[PDB]
């Protein structure tokens, strides 16, 4: 989980291929003793990674630990679905802005359940007469909430990006 194959720019063609996997936190001198040096300093050749997100080929290791600390900052159900949540967003501090603004639904599993939750148990309208009990179009209600609300269908539930 969350480990990188990063060495080295010396012998740029992935010659001097060393340094297998580095879980976080990752140090300059730790990897430097892992690899030696390439007679100078041109290292952390990002070429492979077990990460739940998208990383770049020249990201500095301090930025990597920064990203990891932002990952470890977030709750683990969100850490499981960072791939889905980052589709709406573009960065993690951006995600850390509205990290309070996520509605989690383990209880709701499709849009129908979202409609039934926000109508029935929320009580968004009050009266459910027995003459009117069946007669609440959860499908169209979910269509209209899908038009309005930013929704994300995931494995562990449905995540509503409300602002």
């Amino acid at each position: 989980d969350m480990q990188v194959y990063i060495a080295n720019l010396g012998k740029y063609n992935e010659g001097e291929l060393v340094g297998a996997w580095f879980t976080f936190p990752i140090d300059f001198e730790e990897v430097k003793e892992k690899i030696g040096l390439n007679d100078e300093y041109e290292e952390y050749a990002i070429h492979d990674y077990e990460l739940p997100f998208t990383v770049d080929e020249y990201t500095s290791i301090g930025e990597l630990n920064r990203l990891w600390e932002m990952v470890s900052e977030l709750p683990e159900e969100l850490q499981s679905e960072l791939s889905a949540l980052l589709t709406h967003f573009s960065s993690i501090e951006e995600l850390s802005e509205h990290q309070e603004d996520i509605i989690i639904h383990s209880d709701c599993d499709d849009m129908y359940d979202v409609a039934r939750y926000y109508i029935e148990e929320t009580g968004a309208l009050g009266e459910v007469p027995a003459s009117l009990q069946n007669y609440i179009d959860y499908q169209a209600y979910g269509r209209d909430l899908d038009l309005s609300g930013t929704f994300i269908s995931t494995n562990h539930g449905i995540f509503e990006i409300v602002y």
Partner: protein
């Protein structure tokens, strides 16, 4: 003409995990819902969520002199519900809570909310035509008359 929310650090709330059976059944902190709302002076709600649930609920602990407010599901159309919450109780992101600070009377703050309800509905009014409703923004951004502590 004190602008809203500046009298005391009002809170947001915080939503737990309902699958945490230890953090959903036991304990005695009253878990407050907007269907528990609509009443007046609800010290304790119907739901009794766990006292250890604050490990995995991200809520706000409240004193005996807090007030509550909703931001979903009934306003954008009507006047806002409000209740005087009086125990240490907790609440989600479906609604919010206000504690005032020292420049005030919390009953005067409560009834300043309820009094200006016909206009503080209008204050941050739409902010989405969804079940999503009135923001925090102009719920923080309106000048109301707030007198001195001898006059509340």
């Amino acid at each position: 003409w004190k602008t809203l929310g500046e009298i005391g650090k009002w809170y947001g709330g915080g939503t737990p995990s309902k699958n945490k059976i230890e953090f959903w059944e036991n304990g005695s902190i009253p878990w407050i819902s907007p269907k528990d709302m609509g009443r007046t002076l609800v010290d304790s709600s119907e739901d009794y969520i766990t006292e250890e649930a604050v490990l995995h609920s991200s809520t706000k602990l409240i004193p005996a002199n807090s007030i509550a407010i909703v931001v979903r599901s009934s306003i954008l159309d009507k006047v806002l519900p409000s209740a005087l919450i009086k125990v240490p109780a907790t609440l989600n992101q479906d609604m919010k809570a206000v504690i005032p600070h020292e420049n005030i009377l919390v009953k005067y703050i409560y009834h300043m909310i309820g009094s200006r309800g016909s206009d503080i509905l209008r204050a941050a009014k739409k902010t989405g035509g969804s079940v999503a409703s009135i923001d925090s923004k102009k719920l923080f951004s309106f000048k109301i008359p707030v007198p001195n502590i001898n006059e509340q």
